[PDB]
C-alpha cells in the first residue's frame, strides 16, 4: 500500500537558534508530496534504508515499540537496536543473531538508556553518525496520515560508525505505520517570532516553489 | 500578441475643422525620486571586524580603504544637495491667510494640517504611509528633516496660491485667485472671459479632481512604485554586502576569529588574505554600484528641480512637461526620498464639426482672422477663438486685409461687417 | 590637518578616524566537568592495533592538555591540520576520535589527508579536508620480536579504494582474474592480508611505528573535550571581550527573551556571526550586541579665522564617549544657541554650526528663511511701479583634463 | 570662492592622479613595492610569485581609476549638455523657461570663457517697487461686461 506524504517530515537542520527569518538549506529531507509506503501491524518485514528514513505511526494502543538496523542482520557485524516502550528508552549495537521473525517479548561497542495520536520520527546515518529527530500530535483522521506541518526536533546522535542498508520495526508480542526515504533536496525554512520552524518550501517541487 | 491601442481614422478633409465646445480640468500626479539613504561604511571594520592582525594586513593594500570612504562621502553630501536644489527654491517662508476666499477652489487637502505631529498636508500624510548597522555599516540623517521639507512645500504652495508666478521672478505680489486663473487661461490661448463665465464649474472640476487623488492614494498601493523601488534597491544592496561576510572566498572559515583562534600567525595570514581579498572586492562592488545609482538619482533630482521652477513657479509652454493637456498650474507635495507634483491641466472635451476657410472675400479684398478661425454652422460664417467654441460676427475689427481674392487657395465669399 | 594633509584648513566639517568603545574586561567560560581525558589508554597500552583493522577511541566529557603530548621527546612526527598544536589548549571540541594502529617507518607519508597507496587506499583513508593531528613514534623496542612479530597485519589487495574512515575488516579472497576462488587460495586467487613480521634487525624505515590520529569533531553542537584553561565569573550590561567554549568575540552581553529550544547552543546573524549564546555553566541565554561605534567629525571655522573646533561623535550617545546630544550624534565643544540662522556648517537633522560670539563655535537649528504672510484678498492686487536690471553669474563645467595611462608602463615600468 | 564649481573639477581630477601614483608604493603582499628590487633580489621562479602580487594590485588600482573617471566623465557630459542648451536658449535666444537663465524675467545672456567651463552673465528684469490697488475681473457699462485686452 501507498500514500501521499504531504508536507510531513521537516526537522530542525542544525543546533542554531534563528527567528523571524526565511533560511535556505540543502540536506536529506523527505520531498513534499512524495510517495510513502504504508503498513498495518494488526506487518513488519525488512526494508532497505537508502540515504535515510522518515518513519511514522498512528497511536491508541502502544503496539509498535522499536527498530533494528544493519546490512545482513546475522551477527557478521554490529547491528543497531532501539526500543522506546512509552516508559523507557534502551539502545544497543551488538553483533546480534536475530531470527527471521523477531518481536519484543512481553560485541556491544555502545549501549545507552533514558487512532487519537500521530508519532513522527526521522533517522539519518551520514558517515555512520546515526542522528534521530521526532514529534507527536493529536489527530482527527482514523484511516491515514493527515495533511499538515509540524517540524521534528533532534533527540540523539550515536557516534557508532555503522553502515546501514536494511532496517525493520518491532511489535510487542507474547496499528497503521509509514516509511519514506530522504533525498538531498534544497528547502527554504520559515522561522517564526518564537524561533519555531512553522512552514517550508521544497524548492524542486514545482516552478512556483522554485520561484 | 499585444495591442498598441484602438485604431482611429481622423475625419480629415480640406474644409472640415473640429472645435471643442467644452473643457475638463484634469489633476494628474507625477512622482520623482530626489534622494536616497546616506549610508557610510567603515571599510576597516567591515573587512577586519576589529582584528589587529587583519588590520595590519589590510595596510598592504594602501589607499583602497580611504578612497571607498571618500566615494560614499561624496554620494552622501550629494543627497542633501539634491534635496536643497528641489525644495529650497523659495527665499521666504510664505503662508496663506486665515480666510480661504480663493473663488471656490479648495486647497485644504494639499495645504498644512496643524492637528498632525508634523505639519504635513492630508495628501502628504497618505504619501508618507504608502512607502516604507553592525559591521561598520551606518546610516547618516538627512540635513533637512521631513518637518523642514514640509515647510518648504507649504511655502511653495502658499506663494503659488496667493501670488501666482510673481514670487518666482521677484517679490510675491498678491492677486485674487480667479484673476490668477484668468491669466493661466490666456497662457494656454483661451480668452479669459471663458474662466469668469464658467468659474463655479471650473472650481467644482478642480475640487473633484483633487478628491480623486485622495481616493487613488487611499487604495492603490502600487502608485508610489518609483519611491519604493529606490528604497528596495538600497536595502537589497546592504543585505548583499552583509551576506558576503559569510562567504569563505577559499579560506578554512568565513569567521575571522575561527582562523585567529585555531592557527598560528604564519598560517593564519594565508587564510586572512583570502577574506581581505574577497571582502575588499565585495565592498568595491557595492561602492561602484552606489556611484552609478547616485548619478541616476541626481538626474531625477535635476528633473524635479526643473519641474519646480518651470511647472510650480511658472506656467509651461513645453508640451507634456507638466502633465498631459495644456498646463495651467502645479502644486508640490513632499514624499519619502522624493517629490510629488499635482499637475493641473486644461483638456478640451466636446468637439463639434464645422466647415472652415483660410480667408474671406468682401469688396474683392481678402480678409483673414486676427486671432481665430473662420467657421460655419452650414449657412452662416463666424470667427471663433481657436481652443473653445465661441462664435462672433465677422467684422473689420476681428479681421485684417491683405491683397485681393485672386491668390488664396480656398477663399470664400461672405460679408464682413463695419462697426 | 593630518587627515587633509595640509597646514591650512578651510571652513567645514571633516571626518577623522572612527570611535569604538573598547572591551573593559575579558570573560572566559567552559563546562565545569573535572575528568582528565583518557589519552593514556591510547598512547601507553601494552598491545596495539593492526593497520587493516585500526582502533577508534572516543574521547569525550573531559579536560585535555595536548601540550603534554607536543612537549614530549617521544614523538617521531606530529602533523596538525585545520589547527596549530600550540592553540589546542585554548579550544574545545564535541568529541575527539583517536584512531590508532602500527605501520612501518616509511608508511608515515601515507597517514595524511587525500593520500594514495596500500595503507591510504586499502587500510586507513584520511579525507581531503581533515581537521586533527597525526602523531607517530618509532616502537621497535615495543613491537619488534626475534623470528618476527607476526601479530601486525596490513591489507595488500582490495577490488576498489576505501572511502574516508571506511573500516573494511573483511578476510574474503582477492580475485585477480575471471578464475573462481571458492573461498581458498589458488590460481589468480589470494588472501587479501599480509603480516609485517617485525624483527629488531630491521632498519629505521622497516621498524614498527605506533600511530595515533586525533580527529576533532568541531561543530555548532555543544562541546565536551576542552583544553586546561580557567573560567571566570560572568559580566552583563558592559562592553567585554568574551570566550564561550572557544567561541571568542567582543560585545555587550545581556540576559534575553530569545526562546532557545533545549538542543540549541548559539544564535546566528545574517553574516553568520553569533548574536546569542547559552552559557556552559548555567542554562541562560545571553544576547550579544556590538560595543558602540561611529565616525568622529571635526567642525571648524577656517584656520584663517580661529583655531577653535567642535567634535561630533556620529550616532553615539553622550554617556558612551560643552556637551550636547543631537539626532546626528553627541556634539562636544559647541555652544548650543536658541537663535536660528542660515545653515553655515551642516551637522544633520536640521542642526548646523557656525563661529560667533566669547568668539566660539555655536550650534543651532537652521532657519529656512524669513516668514511672510502675502497680503491676499479677493479684491487686492499689487503692481510694480518701477524695476531693476539684474546681471547674475552662472558657472558650468564643460570639460576635464584629457589624461592617458599606458597601463603596461604604469604596472610594469 | 565664486569659481568653486570649476576649481572642484580641477581638484577631483588632480586627487585621482595623485591617488593612482601613490598606489605604486603599496606592496599588495609582495616583499617590496619596487619592481627592480624584487628582480635584483630574487631568482625567476620565486620573483614571479612576488611580481604577480604587484601586477594583481596595480591592475586593480588602475581599473578603479578608469571606472571612476568613466563615472565622472558622465557628470561632466551632463553639465556640458546643459551648458550647450543655455548657449542656444539664452545667448542665441530669449528663454521663457522659469529660472533657466537666472532669477527674474530673462532679457539676455552673455557667454564668457573660463578654465574647463563657461560662465554666463544672465541679464534679467526684476520688478522692484510695489503699490497696492483694489481690482476687478470685469467692468459693467450699458449692461455689457467688459474685460481688459
Ligand atoms: C505511489 O506509487 C504507486 C506505484 O508504485 C502509484 O500507484 C501511486 O499512485 C503513487 N502515489 C502517489 C501519492 O504518488
Ligand atoms: C520499558 O522497559 C523497561 C526495561 O528497560 C521495563 O522495566 C518497563 O516495564 C517497560 N515499560 C513498558 C510500558 O513496557
Ligand atoms: C564478538 O567478536 C567475536 C570475534 O572477535 C565473535 O566470535 C562473537 O560472535 C562476537 N560477539 C557476538 C555477541 O556475536
Ligand atoms: C509566541 O509565544 C508567545 C508566548 O511566549 C505567544 O503569546 C505568541 O502567541 C507566540 N506567537 C507566535 C507567532 O507563535
Ligand atoms: C465629423 O464629421 C464626420 C463626417 O463623416 C463624422 O464621421 C465624425 O464622426 C464627426 N465628428 C464629430 C466630433 O462630430
Ligand atoms: C477642397 O477640395 C475641393 C475638391 O475636392 C476644391 O473644390 C475646394 O476648392 C477645396 N477647398 C479648400 C478650402 O481648399
Ligand atoms: C556546573 O554546571 C551545571 C550545568 O551544566 C550547573 O547545574 C551547576 O550549578 C554548575 N556548578 C558550578 C559550581 O559551576
Ligand atoms: C583671512 O583672514 C583675514 C584676517 O585674518 C581677512 O582679511 C581675509 O579676508 C580672510 N580671507 C578669507 C578667504 O577668509
Ligand atoms: C542615551 O543614554 C541614556 C541612558 O544613559 C538614555 O536614557 C537616552 O535615551 C539615550 N539617548 C539616545 C539619543 O540614545
Ligand atoms: C532654549 O530654550 C528652552 C525652552 O524653550 C530652554 O529649556 C533651553 O535651556 C534654552 N537653551 C539655551 C542654550 O538657552
Ligand atoms: C499692501 O497692503 C498690506 C495690507 O495689510 C500691507 O501690509 C502692505 O505693506 C502693503 N504693501 C505696499 C507695497 O503698499
From Swiss-Prot, chain B:
The record marks 120-121 as: Cleavage. Residues 228-272 form a coiled coil. Changing residue 101 to H: In strain: B.1.1.318. Changing residue 69 to K: In strain: Omicron/BA.1, Omicron/BA.2, Omicron/BA.2.12.1, Omicron/BA.2.75, Omicron/BA.4, Omicron/BA.5, Omicron/BQ.1.1, Omicron/XBB.1.5, Omicron/EG.5.1. Glycans are attached at residues 14, 22, 106, 353, 377, 413. Changing residue 350 to H: In strain: Kappa/B.1.617.1. Changing residue 380 to Y: In strain: Theta/P.3. Changing residue 135 to K: In strain: Omicron/BA.1. Residues 199-249 are annotated as: Heptad repeat 1. Disulfide bonds join 43-65, 48-54, 311-322, 361-405. Changing residue 138 to N: In strain: Lambda/C.37. Precursor of the fusion protein processed in the biosynthesis of the S protein and the formation of virus particle. Mediates fusion of the virion and cellular membranes by functioning as a class I viral fusion protein. Contains two viral fusion peptides that are unmasked after cleavage. The S2/S2' cleavage occurs during virus entry at the cell membrane by host TMPRSS2 or during endocytosis by host CSTL. This is Spike protein S2. The lineage of its organism: Viruses, Riboviria, Orthornavirae, Pisuviricota, Pisoniviricetes.
UniProtKB/Swiss-Prot annotation, chain D:
Changing residue 129 to H: In strain: Kappa/B.1.617.1. Disulfide bonds join 90-101. Changing residue 39 to F: In strain: Omicron/BA.1. It comes from the Viruses. Residues 7-51 form a coiled coil. Glycans are attached at residue 132. Changing residue 85 to I: In strain: Gamma/P.1. Subunit of the fusion protein that is processed upon entry into the host cell. Mediates fusion of the virion and cellular membranes by functioning as a class I viral fusion protein. Contains a viral fusion peptide that is unmasked after S2 cleavage. This cleavage can occur at the cell membrane by host TMPRSS2 or during endocytosis by host CSTL. In either case, this triggers an extensive and irreversible conformational change that leads to fusion of the viral envelope with the cellular cytoplasmic membrane, releasing viral genomic RNA into the host cell cytoplasm. This is Spike protein S2'.
